Amino acid sequence: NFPIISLDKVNGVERAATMEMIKDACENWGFFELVNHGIPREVMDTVEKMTKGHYKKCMEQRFKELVASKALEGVQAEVTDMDWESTFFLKHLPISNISEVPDLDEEYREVMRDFAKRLEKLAEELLDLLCENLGLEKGYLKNAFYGSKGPNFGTKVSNYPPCPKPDLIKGLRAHTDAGGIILLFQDDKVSGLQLLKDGQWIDVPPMRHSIVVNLGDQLEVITNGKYKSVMHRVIAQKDGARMSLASFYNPGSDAVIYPAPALVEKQVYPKFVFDDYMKLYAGLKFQAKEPRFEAMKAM
Amino acid sequence: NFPIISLDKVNGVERAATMEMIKDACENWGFFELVNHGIPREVMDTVEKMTKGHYKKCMEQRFKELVASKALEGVQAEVTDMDWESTFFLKHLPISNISEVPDLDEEYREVMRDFAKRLEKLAEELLDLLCENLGLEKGYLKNAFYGSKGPNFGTKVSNYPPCPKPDLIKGLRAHTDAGGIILLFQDDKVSGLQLLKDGQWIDVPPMRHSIVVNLGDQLEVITNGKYKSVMHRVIAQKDGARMSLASFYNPGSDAVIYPAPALVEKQVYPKFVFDDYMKLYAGLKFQAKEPRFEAMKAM
Amino acid sequence: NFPIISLDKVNGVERAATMEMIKDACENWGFFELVNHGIPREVMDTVEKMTKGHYKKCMEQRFKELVASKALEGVQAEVTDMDWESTFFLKHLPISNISEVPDLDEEYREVMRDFAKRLEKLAEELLDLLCENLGLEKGYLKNAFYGSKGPNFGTKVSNYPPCPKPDLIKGLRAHTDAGGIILLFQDDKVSGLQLLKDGQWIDVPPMRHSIVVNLGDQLEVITNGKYKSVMHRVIAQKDGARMSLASFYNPGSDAVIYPAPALVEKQVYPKFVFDDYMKLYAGLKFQAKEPRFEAMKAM
Amino acid sequence: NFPIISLDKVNGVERAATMEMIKDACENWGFFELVNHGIPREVMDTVEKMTKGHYKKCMEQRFKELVASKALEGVQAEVTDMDWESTFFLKHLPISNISEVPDLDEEYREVMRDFAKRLEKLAEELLDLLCENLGLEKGYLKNAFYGSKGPNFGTKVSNYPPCPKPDLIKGLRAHTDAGGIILLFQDDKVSGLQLLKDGQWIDVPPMRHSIVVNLGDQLEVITNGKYKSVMHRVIAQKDGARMSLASFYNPGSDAVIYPAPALVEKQVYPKFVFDDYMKLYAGLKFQAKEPRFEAMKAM
């Protein structure tokens, strides 16, 4: 059954069992849901109410523009013509950009700086706990993620409607995350997040004040396939969550990722610079003919 | 209570009462819901299933493009990033364009030609019934709508998600329709359509296999304010309709609209060409300075 | 012949003749070209080189994105597929926004603050010179433009290619400017700006280090038709200017514009709040039915 | 010096020398310019005048929309705000779509059907001439391009302004064409097309009534590197061409491309299905993690 982990229990006598759940989650699920994670409910509830406030502003503004755009063509804009989807990204590390993102309150910007510093601390704690389970030095993964300027840490803030009906959302393509460790905060209890475990869809159980954690492709490389990045997809439920803060703690652009030499005995995962993996992901690496001829010879 | 009108009863002994409901609806509601309207359930159910099929194709295509667009920026497209709103228009009269609209099946195009001819016949029947209640010649409104080339008749086909939550949709601007007579076919029974009667929102009652009819600004002019066009808005409900075919039967561009001289005794509504009203609606009429100076002198 | 005015000559013995040219320009041309205007060539040449630098960055960035967008569809982006047009606005008064506009250098932002303060001083000087020619109190127009928070002052920065060929640009719609006083700085000497004087197109003569000034609709109201806002259009020449900084000094949103009572003897121009004129200009004023019925009755 | 080839001379006594020029062009230039190519000047001049007519319609329409869009925001659209770039594609083989492309005259559609049939005949002639020079069977390349349904043949029609200045266009990325054989028809004599021969830019010489031909990546594979696809880019000149019809004759999606076994003695170019090469080109092939791990191991 799905790993739900009370993170505070790692401080007390039930540490061995809690670290075991994390080990089990990392090896067999690629995902776990955290509660009692050292981020107050007051802080999370602030983030929710404020983000929903910003969203409400954007939709009232968007409708005024739609009515004007549509009226230009001699057509009445209905409320049913609304694009309810809104998403924007907030970079934190190595260079923050919360001061430069358009159309935010100063008190909103300040709470997201507070939210980001809290999350990188949680992210870095979890990586240390992983380091311990793997039998590795403290801060090995933080070190490996660093590169020169430091690790890439940012947050995708999204607000969205429910899906019109399930059968449309069926047959949609899933993915594994290319990054390092990914921390999802949502409103409600129902995430609408599904894992593809043994050919079948398992829903992430609903939990209030939770943070859902999962491991990306980079940690699979570093652990030499031991902690695998798992196939998944998020879908908006009819009476579930309609707000998602997805914070990605990835390696820095120039960080050289490779399997930790300790975790290699008797195939071997590759060595590469993180930006090149992301450049492959975005289709930039085969923009000339000679590379394409290499690739077609390999196949 | 809201006028629900069985149109077949106009053929039988209960005609007087049915015409009375239409008169009451036209004068005090500006809206009525038709059942038994001479369009088979089989024909409507075909239109629904086929349109939803086309919509499903567009969303699977749209997601493939989104995943590719987002991957270009080194970002994973989630299903929650989907724009579920899709809308396109089908002109019928005076010049049909169902053959030229991109990405439709031939069997779909053919059903919409069949659907359009059925609706203009219903539209023109209703106008005659209105002519009778007003004490006017048969086909007076059809005549008045004609102009030179004939009346404008088309259909807005829309598919959309539910609204994330009510409080966002609250405070949204309502309208009266600028056109002639407007016929709304929907799936489900719940329209999500609201009238603004005496300062308060009244929902259009849910009815299966119904066509909701309402009168636009042009009929108010022609009736000299007797049949007023009513304030309204449509909002997508959480478990209501998610498909809307809104067919507008408006006057032709060059049609001269004015109050029928019979309906004038002891202020008088204006005379104008329909295209000029629509050019005013779209803000094209005050594109030069001299017109603006006229308007500011009037205020 | 077109009014070219050396502004420094207003300090010396040739003031009467220079003020006469301004009077003539304001009454019979609606336009004049300033030289020796109290903005150093060094300051203007800085603005040019820096803005062209920012533009070059945007086009290299835009092409990288186009190549990626087009490659997504299995198509090679040619250089001939480039959208060379780029335009952005910089608000100065009442609230500056040069700090918040994306993708600018700090040294660029700082020069535009310096450029803006210089131009509002020039703008306000010219309005005083107009006040003198009209026989009005010093700062009357600045006062009238103020409202509550102060006048609207901003700058449209544009970079663009030449027009493919003249015959495409022929038959294009001209305008008068809705605002107050409009100050155009360009690179090159050839503006590509044309006036519509007595039914015929007159080119603004080419002059290096010039600022082209023209009067908008608001000054025509305030002068009771004496200083008329003139029809014009700007067109990119094959070997002329390819950069335009158009700074608009308009009245504040809440400023009540009306003909100065001194300038009224034996029709009278209207009184209105500036925002309402701009709301009429944008087609927002006839978004409901009752207003439209007023307008159609007037016609 | 650049290969300019009179194609009619292949019928007469000067055939050996003309075929030698084609061999030289194919081996050392990857490009040649055809004259007297069996497409009348009357037919080409029709294509030019008609396409420019369609373009003029689109720009007058685009400006009307821009003026309305910009006026919505309380801003005057200048002619200098125009996006002059317009481009659309016309599929011919295996399935024509000239009947379905929006906003074309019937007489325009018909001329493009006539133009397409002429070009595929020219394309297939040239491939036979190449087959002869390579020492291959007649129609070997046409056969190899076929797959199941037949070869992909279409035409990119583009209209565009000149580049604002050269130094912006400098440092822009060049390419080789991924397709088969590519035939460029232009107005004017100046193409603005440049080859990257021995590290340096060579302009394609200006010639009236010419068709510029070049070889893509697929022909390099089939010839086992003998006929190489050459680096190039097209740039709009200040007083050169402003219209480009680029017709691509590529292999069919399912066509298996590989080096002709005759042309292999003592590295070997790869075998692949054409769609997979184009799927690699568009970045779709590394959308999952396992493929990316293969690619990073190879590097």
Ligand code: NI
């Ligand atoms: Ni994910």
Ligand code: NI
């Ligand atoms: Ni409506």
Ligand code: NI
């Ligand atoms: Ni202007």
Ligand code: NI
């Ligand atoms: Ni090319």
